[PDB]
Amino acid sequence: VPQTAAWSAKTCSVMVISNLLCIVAGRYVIQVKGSGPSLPLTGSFSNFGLPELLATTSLGHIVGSGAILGLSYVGLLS
Amino acid sequence: MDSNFLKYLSTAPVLLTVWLSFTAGLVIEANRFFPDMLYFPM
Amino acid sequence: KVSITVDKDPVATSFEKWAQPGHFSRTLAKGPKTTTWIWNLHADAHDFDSHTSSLEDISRKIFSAHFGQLSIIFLWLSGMYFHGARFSNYSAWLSNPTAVKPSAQVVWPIVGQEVLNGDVGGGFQGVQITSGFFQIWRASGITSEVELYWCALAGLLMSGLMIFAGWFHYHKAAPKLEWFQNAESMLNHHLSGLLGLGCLSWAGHQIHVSLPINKLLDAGVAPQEIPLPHEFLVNRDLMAQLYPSFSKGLVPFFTLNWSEYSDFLTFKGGLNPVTGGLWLSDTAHHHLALAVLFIVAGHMYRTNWGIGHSMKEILEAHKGPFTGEGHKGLYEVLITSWHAQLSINLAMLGSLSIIIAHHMYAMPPYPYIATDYPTQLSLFTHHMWIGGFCVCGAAAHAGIFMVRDYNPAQNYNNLLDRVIRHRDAIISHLNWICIFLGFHSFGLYIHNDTMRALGRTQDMFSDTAIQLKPVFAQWVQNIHTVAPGNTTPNALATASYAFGGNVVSVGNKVAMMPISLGTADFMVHHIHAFTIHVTVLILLKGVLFSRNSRLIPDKANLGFRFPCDGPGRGGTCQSSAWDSVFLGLFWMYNCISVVIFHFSWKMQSDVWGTVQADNTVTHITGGNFAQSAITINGWLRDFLWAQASQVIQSYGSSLSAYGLIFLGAHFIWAFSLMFLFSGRGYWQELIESVVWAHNKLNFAPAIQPRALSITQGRAVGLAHYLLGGIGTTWAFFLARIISVG
Amino acid sequence: GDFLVHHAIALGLHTTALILVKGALDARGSKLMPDKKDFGYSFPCDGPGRGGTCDISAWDAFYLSMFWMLNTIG
Amino acid sequence: GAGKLQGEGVTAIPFAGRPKTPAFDGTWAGDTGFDPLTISAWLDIRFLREAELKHCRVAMLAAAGAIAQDAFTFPGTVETFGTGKMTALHDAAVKTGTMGQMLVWIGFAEIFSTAAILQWYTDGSTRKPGDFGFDPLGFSKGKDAARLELCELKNGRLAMIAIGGMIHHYLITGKGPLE
Amino acid sequence: DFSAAVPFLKRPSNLDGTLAGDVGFDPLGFSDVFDLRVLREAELKHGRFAMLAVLGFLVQEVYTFPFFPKMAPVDAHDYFVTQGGGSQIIFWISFVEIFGVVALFELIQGKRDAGDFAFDPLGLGKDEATLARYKVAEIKHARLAMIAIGGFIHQFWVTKQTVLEQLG
Ligand code: CLA
Ligand code: CLA
Ligand SMILES: CC1=C(C#C/C(C)=C/C=C/C(C)=C/C=C/C=C(C)/C=C/C=C(C)/C=C/C2=C(C)CCCC2(C)C)C(C)(C)C[C@H](O)C1
Ligand SMILES: CC1=C(C#C/C(C)=C/C=C/C(C)=C/C=C/C=C(C)/C=C/C=C(C)/C=C/C2=C(C)CCCC2(C)C)C(C)(C)C[C@H](O)C1
Numbered sequence A: 001v002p003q004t005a006a007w008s009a010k011t012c013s014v015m016v017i018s019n020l021l022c023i024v025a026g027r028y029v030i031q032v033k034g035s036g037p038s039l040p041l042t043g044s045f046s047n048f049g050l051p052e053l054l055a056t057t058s059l060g061h062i063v064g065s066g067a068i069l070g071l072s073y074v075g076l077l078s
Numbered sequence B: 001m002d003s004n005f006l007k008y009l010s011t012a013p014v015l016l017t018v019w020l021s022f023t024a025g026l027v028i029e030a031n032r033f034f035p036d037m038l039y040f041p042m
Numbered sequence C: 001k002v003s004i005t006v007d008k009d010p011v012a013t014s015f016e017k018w019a020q021p022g023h024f025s026r027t028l029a030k031g032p033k034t035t036t037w038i039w040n041l042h043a044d045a046h047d048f049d050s051h052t053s054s055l056e057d058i059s060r061k062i063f064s065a066h067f068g069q070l071s072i073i074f075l076w077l078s079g080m081y082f083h084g085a086r087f088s089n090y091s092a093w094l095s096n097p098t099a100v101k102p103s104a105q106v107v108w109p110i111v112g113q114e115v116l117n118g119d120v121g122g123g124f125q126g127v128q129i130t131s132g133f134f135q136i137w138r139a140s141g142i143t144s145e146v147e148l149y150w151c152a153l154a155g156l157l158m159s160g161l162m163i164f165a166g167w168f169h170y171h172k173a174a175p176k177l178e179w180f181q182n183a184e185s186m187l188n189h190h191l192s193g194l195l196g197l198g199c200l201s202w203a204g205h206q207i208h209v210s211l212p213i214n215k216l217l218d219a220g221v222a223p224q225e226i227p228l229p230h231e232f233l234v235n236r237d238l239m240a241q242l243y244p245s246f247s248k249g250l251v252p253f254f255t256l257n258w259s260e261y262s263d264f265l266t267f268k269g270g271l272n273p274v275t276g277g278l279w280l281s282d283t284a285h286h287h288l289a290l291a292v293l294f295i296v297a298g299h300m301y302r303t304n305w306g307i308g309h310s311m312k313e314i315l316e317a318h319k320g321p322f323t324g325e326g327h328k329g330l331y332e333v334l335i336t337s338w339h340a341q342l343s344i345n346l347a348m349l350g351s352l353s354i355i356i357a358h359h360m361y362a363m364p365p366y367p368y369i370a371t372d373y374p375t376q377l378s379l380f381t382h383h384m385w386i387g388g389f390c391v392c393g394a395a396a397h398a399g400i401f402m403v404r405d406y407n408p409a410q411n412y413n414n415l416l417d418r419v420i421r422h423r424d425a426i427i428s429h430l431n432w433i434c435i436f437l438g439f440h441s442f443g444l445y446i447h448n449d450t451m452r453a454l455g456r457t458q459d460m461f462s463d464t465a466i467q468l469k470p471v472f473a474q475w476v477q478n479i480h481t482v483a484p485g486n487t488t489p490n491a492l493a494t495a496s497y498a499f500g501g502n503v504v505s506v507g508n509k510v511a512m513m514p515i516s517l518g519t520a521d522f523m524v525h526h527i528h529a530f531t532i533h534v535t536v537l538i539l540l541k542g543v544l545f546s547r548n549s550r551l552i553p554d555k556a557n558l559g560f561r562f563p564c565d566g567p568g569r570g571g572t573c574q575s576s577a578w579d580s581v582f583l584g585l586f587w588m589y590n591c592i593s594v595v596i597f598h599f600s601w602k603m604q605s606d607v608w609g610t611v612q613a614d615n616t617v618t619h620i621t622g623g624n625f626a627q628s629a630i631t632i633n634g635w636l637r638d639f640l641w642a643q644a645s646q647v648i649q650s651y652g653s654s655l656s657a658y659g660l661i662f663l664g665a666h667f668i669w670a671f672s673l674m675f676l677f678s679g680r681g682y683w684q685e686l687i688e689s690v691v692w693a694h695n696k697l698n699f700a701p702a703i704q705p706r707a708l709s710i711t712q713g714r715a716v717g718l719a720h721y722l723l724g725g726i727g728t729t730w731a732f733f734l735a736r737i738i739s740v741g
Numbered sequence D: 001g002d003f004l005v006h007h008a009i010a011l012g013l014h015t016t017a018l019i020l021v022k023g024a025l026d027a028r029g030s031k032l033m034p035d036k037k038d039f040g041y042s043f044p045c046d047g048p049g050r051g052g053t054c055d056i057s058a059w060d061a062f063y064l065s066m067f068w069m070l071n072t073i074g
Numbered sequence E: 001g002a003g004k005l006q007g008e009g010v011t012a013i014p015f016a017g018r019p020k021t022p023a024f025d026g027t028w029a030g031d032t033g034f035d036p037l038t039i040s041a042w043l044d045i046r047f048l049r050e051a052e053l054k055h056c057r058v059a060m061l062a063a064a065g066a067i068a069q070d071a072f073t074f075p076g077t078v079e080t081f082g083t084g085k086m087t088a089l090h091d092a093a094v095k096t097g098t099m100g101q102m103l104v105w106i107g108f109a110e111i112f113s114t115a116a117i118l119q120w121y122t123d124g125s126t127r128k129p130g131d132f133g134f135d136p137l138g139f140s141k142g143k144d145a146a147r148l149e150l151c152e153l154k155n156g157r158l159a160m161i162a163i164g165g166m167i168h169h170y171l172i173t174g175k176g177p178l179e
Numbered sequence F: 001d002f003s004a005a006v007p008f009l010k011r012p013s014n015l016d017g018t019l020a021g022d023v024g025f026d027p028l029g030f031s032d033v034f035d036l037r038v039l040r041e042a043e044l045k046h047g048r049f050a051m052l053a054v055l056g057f058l059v060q061e062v063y064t065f066p067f068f069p070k071m072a073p074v075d076a077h078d079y080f081v082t083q084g085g086g087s088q089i090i091f092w093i094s095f096v097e098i099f100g101v102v103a104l105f106e107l108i109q110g111k112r113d114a115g116d117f118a119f120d121p122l123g124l125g126k127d128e129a130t131l132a133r134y135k136v137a138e139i140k141h142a143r144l145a146m147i148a149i150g151g152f153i154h155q156f157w158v159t160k161q162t163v164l165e166q167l168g
């Protein structure tokens, strides 16, 4: 059976980085934006909407779970 | 009762099903109370 | 915008139209001048597309019809559960599943039919059932008739809810066409909600109810002594005895420490040594993973919030140099035609049924289903038939779309147009391949029959002679046998023991053992290929030539279902897509009959049997398939003549019903040939003579009697042919397998 | 058993005779195709008009009796 | 209900500014211009305020109940349930069946709450969010109505965080709210 | 339009207050999809059965006929099922309900008032004022008895004690 390590600073860091990476990528890759306001941010993050934030965080959680499990499998995280 | 519902009940398939179910019940009960009648008793 | 919009009170609930048959149709509302009107009423009852031109009306009718179908299915399920609760031997079967035959039907003692209440076991005599409901309930963790009564109550309540929903959504709040044409939202909700939450709820039920109850049952605890599911739910210590990881809680889940759940979420593989079915602890993990997959898949399409795909964009973007415009127009076709959707969905559902039959036999999923040979055979053949029928219906509704809802203006140089523009190449090549397969699959059997009849047994295509070894299938079997530990490292056993491995035996009887492929298997597989290809030829040829051909340039005007176009051009009989479906249904019957015969003989000769104390297994037929299944005489004698003894010697037993149905199915099959070999003129003239007889007595119906239409005669012939053939096989299979298991 | 098979034979003879006699007597004309003698003995049909006229020939009656004759001799 | 405290003028996050959603017209009470995530642009303000007032009421009642259970225990409970405080008391009352009866009756009330919420969309009810007509003694009947509305929302917001703190303090120290 | 009974719930459209005991209570909207007259007939049949059931429970607890074995009201059900008296009561209730079907059809046709079977043997409802007061009283007592009979039966099942015995 693979190894799944207990919660730790490493797991939290992996999850946070996956979420941030997916947020930035969602900035680059999400073609259509919904119709509403935007979360209070300026510059590149000037049309970041709540649905886009939620979608990017969902994908970030998927990616973080996958990376955590895979790195525990190969033994690197654990 | 609605006359339209009564006409529907008077439609051919409903009447055929009800009449043949009644006939089947008649034969089944006749055979249930007087079974194995291969002949008229004389 | 994906939004809800309905019309309130579009149709008033009243019996006025119940007394006006044919109201839905303009030609039929007038009245029955002839008896053809009666048949037309039923042939056009559910052809909503021919009642009105309103897509909104058609969609509302379809929605409500679906609700009615769901209510009927729920009533069916409630009836099965109630019969299991009241008229069954389920408790005795739980006590001793390997000795008492499952039964949930009892007959009344009227004309001596009480003989059909055979000695199934457990102090109970009824009709042995082959549907697998007992094993379904055992896997679900049901251990009482009270729970089955509650299941029946739930089914009845859901049937009532569904019928009410149908009435409400036709007569009170009917959604609009904009509501119906939400493919993205509907697929999102189906995938995520319906499928994902369904398998998630089932995984929860298995983790909290099925797993511990079945653990104790396999441990040998009495069904009465096993605690109740709510006891398991609220006593985390009791559950933590059977599965020690529940003392850990959900913290591992939310911290991604999922290995803590390996005790009840595992990838063991193989079969449970006690029950002979799949590990319910594997099924729980299977359904949880499927839930995750479906909930993720259901977040792909755009509904209201910008994130997502548009299938129109995807399809229009997928085009290449060999396909011109590619998938352009398909999104519109599929959100404007119910027949195209029905064809796709029927094809997929039938293929799924076939896949399900294969897997459910090789990987018995329920406890004690594998050694219940009648259940296995019955389920396999049943789902094979459902798959074949669904595929033929897919062809029929593809043809209906091509005739009715196909518009060349909207389909220019797209994939559909290009297919129609080279249909001749497709059909000619499929014709050639069908002929080649027919030769090199059946002429091999003929060669063997002639060589065995001439005494040249060394010139045959047999394992003891010229060999045709399915090296590719054997190679795949070897891969799957060696995968555990190598290409599926964290799986303890192979997915199925059919690929190879050790015999699984339950109750001194084989549950699943390796299935070995030789020359006979090569031959039968290539015959399966031949039959599938010929059926495809018939159906695809009809669909492609539905609208026009070199023979009839204007056929869409004649319609999807027309008798002919006259005796001219040499004769234009059966030139419609409907007649293509008719012939393809004949050929589907051929294909599935061969498939189920192959299954029956192969499984009775090389898988199923009783294992002796020597560890050696003696099969029901004992290896006759390897050396007999290579000749048509072998099939006629060693399979049909040999195995028909059980059904022809069933009089005086509880299988006497199977014998009688054998004979009656023969009767109906022969009776079909009267409609299939005949024409309408003869019967119309005979009716003329009979009507003269009636008129001679100063009476005759106001509805003038007419012979069946040409299409209706073909339909009646086909229906009786299929009923007779399938019923003959039904009685034969059930009698044989219930006698020898 | 001989009684029952004899009455089966009676059914077979009578039905074969039915098909053949109907073909012979309706060969010249029926209410569906009242000008059959013009078309002859073994024409294919008269088309899908009038409800459909498949097997409306006396040859078809022969073709249909031959099934029944084979049944009865069987 | 002062436009200076709760109103179109207030801004909780100056670097962002007051949102442009229907919730921040200045008519809805307890408005401090606070919605960084812009949830009120995607969910009905009626639904959100109903949920907020339900949370306010439940958490506020729960906090008062925790303080009461620490100060004074009703006769006949300190023995029947045991001597477990707070969430241990919840477990003991679940075993007693007290919590089960509470849940059944609270669900009976929440069924009618569900009907009230649904009637906003089904039959276009004009019911104010969180308004049930419970003003028996009669306080909303005067000029203090808006003030009372603000006090309700503010005290509920205080109570939610206070009860979170109380429960977590109990989970760590094992002590009740009064420590 | 909010309901008089429930201030925060909108008054059901079909419930206009004309019928007795109508306080605007229909949160689940059965009146919206089903005929209010049929529902009222069901309500009064249920309530009449329940009121007579409550009185029967009490009178059976205190008194039982000399020719019938003495037993708690709930057990008398299973006793009479085998004895055959329950069959007779069921058959005669069914006999009256056959005419109840005709009454229901007439009610749908609008020729009758729900629950109005013209049964005033002692002439106690001759004057209107008293008739309306009596109708409100009947619906109120019907609902209360519907609650109370369930209370009685369930309390017996729990305590295995008749209600009169339990109250002390
Ligand atoms: C750096 C990060 C990281 C690391 C180290 C890993 C490492 C690993 N992941 Mg991965 N993973 C990551 C990120 C990472 N992952 C992320 C971000 C995600 C989210 C998307 C995933 C999601 C993910 C899943 C869902 C799974 C893994 C699995 C695994 C482990 C086994 C995979 C394997 O060898 O399968 C090799 C397998 C094959 C070569 C056979 C594949 C064939 C499958 C069964 C069918 C596909 C056929 C398809 C339908 C048709 C073909 C295409 C057709 C068009 C021709 C491996 C240790 C697997 C695991 O844990 O297994 C125990 C697993 O199931 N990962
Ligand atoms: C999801 C399933 C599905 C749905 C929704 C539809 C829907 C439709 N089909 Mg069908 N169809 C299906 C599956 C489906 N089909 C399958 C699987 C096939 C392949 C066999 C077909 C083949 C097919 C053809 C070839 C045609 C249709 C047509 C139609 C339309 C009208 C049908 C009608 O009026 O029936 C009303 C119902 C009947 C006439 C009853 C038929 C039942 C027969 C008589 C056999 C019943 C036997 C039964 C099982 C009992 C046997 C036991 C015995 C002892 C009594 C309608 C849109 C017609 C159409 O669109 O024409 C323009 C049409 O020509 N369908
Ligand atoms: C009964 C029971 C149990 C239980 C339980 C219970 C009752 C658990 C209750 C838990 C609760 C009420 C938690 C609340 C947490 C509040 C937080 C973290 C607030 C954060 C606010 C922030 C960050 C504000 C930020 C900002 C904002 C927005 C505004 C102002 C600025 C600033 C403050 C900076 C268990 C679980 C023990 C189990 C037992 O078997 C049964
Ligand atoms: C099984 C069986 C039998 C039987 C039987 C029989 C006859 C069983 C009968 C069961 C009955 C009548 C149950 C009634 C339950 C009523 C409830 C829960 C009312 C709740 C009302 C509420 C919450 C009102 C709330 C009220 C509302 C809404 C509005 C006003 C305010 C408020 C107070 C809040 C036997 C005896 C023959 C034995 C045999 O072996 C078979």
Ligand SMILES: CC1=C(C/C=C(\C)CCC[C@H](C)CCC[C@H](C)CCCC(C)C)C(=O)c2ccccc2C1=O
Pocket (backbone or CB within 6 Å): C674, C675, C676, C678, C679, C680, C683, C684, C706, C707, C708, C709, C710, C712, C713, C714
């Ligand atoms: C026998 C036969 C007839 C004559 C058969 C007719 C007219 C059928 C009429 C049968 C009656 C009216 C059906 C009712 C009686 C049945 C015993 C009940 C079963 C049928 C229902 C289930 C629908 C044709 O008209 C015909 C037309 C075209 C091709 C082949 C044939 C054909 O073979």
Ligand code: SF4
Pocket (backbone or CB within 6 Å): C563, C564, C565, C566, C567, C571, C572, C573, C574, C679, C710, D044, D045, D046, D047, D048, D052, D053, D054, D055
């Ligand atoms: S009528 Fe009968 S025979 Fe003549 S063409 Fe049409 S089908 Fe062929």
